Symmetry: C2
């Protein structure tokens, strides 16, 4: 479990410099101070290591969001949405290599794809429930179906956060991405 | 060139049923009514076939958008933005397998990635120029930097159009995706 954490730290450190395809099991064993068969005792494959790393990062974001949901900020609605979006900006932005590699793995691994899909459904359902609350309270007008609006806003964040972290061309500079998303969320949720 | 079109039609037809990884050069040659070495005369690889198919689809969208830019619809601004977004909805939605496969290839092929990147820069620059025109005319307020807003809106369309076409979970139903995007564009461009 000390050895399990070493393998995970090693893989995260190596993913900073090259993609999964260019990391071997022997690379992971060696960085973690173990042999190849001992590695295989903890994980069936390098792909299982990535899946665990992504799982931990996705769970970290999810728990931070649950914490925030229970403990709303005392501020205006634009700043509340910013604090929510910020959960993902900071959590995934603190783990850029796992983010990029976990995202590429969605194409090749059904476990990575299903993990992503489960959490995006949860985050979208929570986004729609808050939009519905805002509407029920008369702060937001009833425009699009809340679930469809929430779906597009979450997919926008996914693609736009992750492009910014990878410094893709094109992308929103990382120091501008938070304000850019919060503007689009607030205008599309509250705007007639 | 008759044989080149056959290879392209064959690959598009086969991509409807399986990914590129599961299509062989011999599969492409056989569907197009040629041998393997004759195939290799027209394309250096199955990846070069995908790149050409994506190139044709991206150019088709780009030209349709240029046509629209010169020949604006005579209608209210919400419907004008809808006609623009619709270029991509119809062009890429008419070529779903190429869209999905071209998008997966971005991870593995620098030519596919560079092609995508060039056109997204062009479409974003045109989006920002129209937003700037709307602002200059006093129809839209000066909120976010236009280029940053345009970048996020284009990345939203990319991810949300393509998720809907692939029937990803989660996604906006394809029959609702156009209205959903147009709402977010109009509110975020015109909303204070
Ligand atoms: O970015 C998101 N989803 C995509 C995640 C990604 F990027 F990692 F893919 C995201 C998902 C959900 C939220 C949210 C929220 C709402 N909670 S809230 O901000 O605390 C809030 C706002 C307004 C009133 C009450 C509470 C914000 C952002
Ligand atoms: O969807 C887009 N880009 C992403 C493409 C994708 F999805 F394939 F990745 C997209 C890019 C640009 C536009 C546009 C536009 C503006 N032209 S316009 O709609 O004709 C117009 C509107 C308002 C006033 C004047 C003209 C619309 C959509």
């Amino acid at each position: 479990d000390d050895r399990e954490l070493a393998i995970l730290a090693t893989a995260e450190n190596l993913l900073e410099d090259r993609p999964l395809a260019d990391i071997s099991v022997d690379d992971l064993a060696k960085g973690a101070g173990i042999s190849r068969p001992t590695f295989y005792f903890y994980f069936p494959s390098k792909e299982a290591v990535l899946l665990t790393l992504l799982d931990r990062v996705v769970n970290q974001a999810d728990m931070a969001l649950q914490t925030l949901a229970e403990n709303p900020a005392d501020t205006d609605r634009e700043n509340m949405w910013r604090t929510g979006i910020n959960v993902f900006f900071e959590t995934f932005g603190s783990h850029k290599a796992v983010t990029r590699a976990g995202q590429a793995a969605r194409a090749t691994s059904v476990e990575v794809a299903e993990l992503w899909s489960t959490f995006m459904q949860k985050w979208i359902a929570y986004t729609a429930a808050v939009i519905d609350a805002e509407r029920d309270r008369g702060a937001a007008p009833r425009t699009l179906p809340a679930h469809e609006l929430a779906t597009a806003l979450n997919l926008m964040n996914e693609r736009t956060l992750f492009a910014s972290f990878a410094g893709e061309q094109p992308s929103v500079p990382e120091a501008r991405v938070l304000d850019t998303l919060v503007h689009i969320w607030v205008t599309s949720i509250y705007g007639e």
